[PDB]
């Protein structure tokens, strides 16, 4: 009938009717395509579907390392099949889970730090059962991951999905994130992107401290019950104060950002089993903070003013003042993280690494799922290698799917 299209900048929406007149023989520019999402359930996974996937995975895992263990393979294959027919679902050996997480990461077409896919700390929280218990596992995660600035990649795996009405889910987009408050005088303070979610926290009893960098509360839902609100212990949230290595007035901007990039709302699918809650984290890439968080008009939007303070022709677009500015914001981010001994990688070194990984991936298994639109840094495109590298985007398994925002499909 018509496809909806969103301009994440102005938020505006559009309905494309013209595409119907296409000749035939692409949704690559879409953000959250239903092909990359794995929604809710109401009934368990039909055994006929589960068994095939489960069998494949056990073959992937067992046919993973050098010199196989056929005895164990066929044994596990059997033990797994049986468990499925007797219990319905099944449990992955801790080793399998570890293998599962690293693979799913490895199979993440939008990630650029996949060269690190093997170095990942795994926290088995499959035995968890309450919100308070989640909050604890999450805190442990944050503490381990942060590591006083020397960031360590980790993922905490909560109980897999069973029937559907019993799902473990973190409502936050990511572990640490700033709140966005709509001020009385119309202005928007904080992270404009978290406006709607900040409200939900308010509605659930959270006390808004109306500031620019107020760390949002953890909103967790265990088993199936309603989400409970927990504030993250301030001692656990390490931040970095933004300061330029030449511009003294940069510190006067009063900017800062959290050191831990931990995605909290994705679903890890593996061997037919799916875990709707599994927060993971790596470390930041400069451009993410300096270009996205800081310069997007839908976020902190600091380009206009960082420009003036540089004596740039803010009103003459062709002067390339925007190019000039963002780069200085980037050096600030990079410089500040380096100065405050917090791990971070610049987009150039990062790209060179993905290219290295990508080639290691084809040589190792003839392939590497890669979404160009996401891998190319928000700045200095072609100055980067990945820009010139053609790539094939495809969903393998295990995989880290997206999921329908919980506050939509959830009866209280």
Ligand X SMILES: O=[N+]([O-])c1cccc2cn[nH]c12
Residue with smaller CB distance to ligand HEM, 17 or 360: 360
Please tell me which residue in 243, 269, 288, 361 is annotated as part of the active site.
288
Residues 342, 148: Cα–Cα separation, whole Å: 8
Residue from 144, 213, 247, 387 binding ligand H4B (CB under 6 A)? 387
Residue with smaller CB distance to ligand H4B, 202 or 373: 373
Is residue 304 flagged as an active site residue? Answer: no
Of 103, 101, 116, 106, the C-alpha closest to 353 is: 116
Residue from 138, 151, 376, 406 binding its own copies (CB under 8 A)? 376
- Which one of ligand X, ligand H4B, ligand HEM, none interacts with residue 138, CB within 5 to 8 A by kind? none
Is residue 390 flagged as an active site residue? Answer: no
Compose the 264-283 pattern: x for residues touching ligand X by CB under 6 A, - for all others.
-----------------xxx
Of 403, 257, 253, 220, the C-alpha closest to 340 is: 257
**Is residue 139 within 8 Å of 236, Cβ to Cβ?**
yes
Instruction: For residue 139, say whether it is annotated as part of any ligand binding site.
Output: no
For residue 50, what are its two tokens? 């589960």
Q: Is 154 in the site for ligand X (CB under 6 A)?
A: no
Breaks (C-N over 2.5 A) in the chain follow: 25
Cβ partners under 8 Å of residue 64, min gap 6 = 99
> Residue 24: helix, strand or coil by DSSP?
coil
What single DSSP character describes residue 221?
E
Is residue 96 flagged as an active site residue? Answer: no
Give me the least distance between CB of 224 and its own copies, in Å please. 28
Give me the least distance between CB of 136 and ligand X, in Å please. 22
Say how many Å lie between the first and final Cα of the chain, rounded. Answer: 34
Residue with smaller CB distance to ligand X, 198 or 287: 287
Continuous H helices in 147-241: 195-203
Residue from 70, 74, 75, 392 binding its own copies (CB under 8 A)? 392
Residue with smaller CB distance to ligand HEM, 106 or 244: 106
Cβ partners under 8 Å of residue 255, min gap 6 = 241, 242, 294, 300, 302
Residue with smaller CB distance to ligand X, 169 or 347: 347
Where does this chain touch its own copies (CB under 8 A) — which range of 138-146, 162-170, 205-213, 325-333?
325-333
Residues 362, 372: Cα–Cα separation, whole Å: 16
Binding residues among 27-56 for ligand H4B as defined by CB under 6 A: 29, 31
Is residue 177 flagged as an active site residue? Answer: no
Residues 124, 93: Cα–Cα separation, whole Å: 11
Please tell me which residue in 96, 105, 106, 114 is annotated as part of the active site.
114
Instruction: For residue 403, say whether it is annotated as part of any ligand binding site.
Output: no
Angle between helices 47-62 and 70-87 (to 10 degrees): 160
**Residues identified as active-site:** 111, 114, 283, 288
Q: Which residues are annotated as a binding site for L-arginine?
A: 174, 283-284, 288
């Amino acid at each position: 009938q018509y496809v909806r299209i969103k301009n994440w900048g102005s938020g505006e929406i559009l309905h494309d009717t013209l595409h119907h007149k296409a000749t035939s023989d692409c949704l690559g520019s879409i953000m959250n395509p239903k092909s990359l999402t794995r929604g809710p359930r109401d009934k368990p996974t039909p055994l006929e579907e589960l068994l095939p996937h489960a069998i494949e995975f056990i073959n992937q895992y067992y046919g993973s390392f050098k010199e196989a263990k056929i005895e164990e393979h066929l044994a596990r294959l059997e033990a797994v099949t049986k468990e499925i027919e007797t219990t319905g679902t099944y449990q992955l050996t801790l080793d399998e889970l570890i293998f599962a997480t690293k693979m799913a990461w490895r199979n993440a077409p939008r990630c650029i730090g996949r060269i690190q896919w093997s170095n990942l700390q795994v926290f088995d929280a499959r035995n968890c059962s309450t919100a308070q218990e989640m909050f604890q596992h999450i805190c442990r995660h944050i503490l381990y991951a942060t590591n006083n600035g020397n960031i360590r990649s980790a993922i905490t795996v909560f109980p897999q999905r069973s029937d559907g009405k019993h799902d473990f889910r973190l409502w936050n987009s990511q572990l640490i994130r700033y709140a966005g408050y709509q001020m009385p005088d119309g202005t928007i303070r904080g992270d404009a992107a978290t406006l709607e979610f900040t409200q939900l926290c308010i509605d659930l009893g959270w006390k808004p401290r109306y500031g620019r960098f107020d760390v949002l509360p953890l909103v967790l839902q265990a088993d199936g019950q309603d989400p409970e609100v927990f504030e993250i212990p301030p001692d656990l949230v390490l931040e970095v104060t933004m300061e330029h290595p030449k511009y003294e007035w940069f510190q006067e901007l009063g900017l800062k950002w959290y050191a831990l990039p931990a995605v909290a709302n994705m679903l890890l699918e593996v061997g037919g089993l799916e875990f709707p809650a599994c927060p993971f984290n790596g470390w930041y890439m400069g451009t993410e903070i300096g270009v996205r968080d800081f310069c997007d008009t839908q976020r902190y939007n600091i380009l206009e003013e960082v420009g003036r303070r540089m004596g740039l022709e803010t009103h003459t677009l062709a002067s390339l003042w925007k190019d000039r500015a963002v780069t200085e914001i980037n050096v600030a981010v990079l410089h500040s993280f380096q100065k405050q001994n917090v791990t971070i990688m610049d987009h150039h070194t990062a790209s060179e690494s993905f290219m290295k990984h990508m080639q290691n991936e084809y040589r190792a298994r003839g392939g590497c799922p890669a979404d160009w639109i996401w891998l190319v840094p928000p700045v200095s495109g072609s100055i980067t290698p990945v820009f010139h590298q053609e790539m094939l985007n495809y969903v393998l398994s295990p995989f880290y799917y997206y999921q329908i925002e919980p506050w939509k499909t959830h009866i209280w």
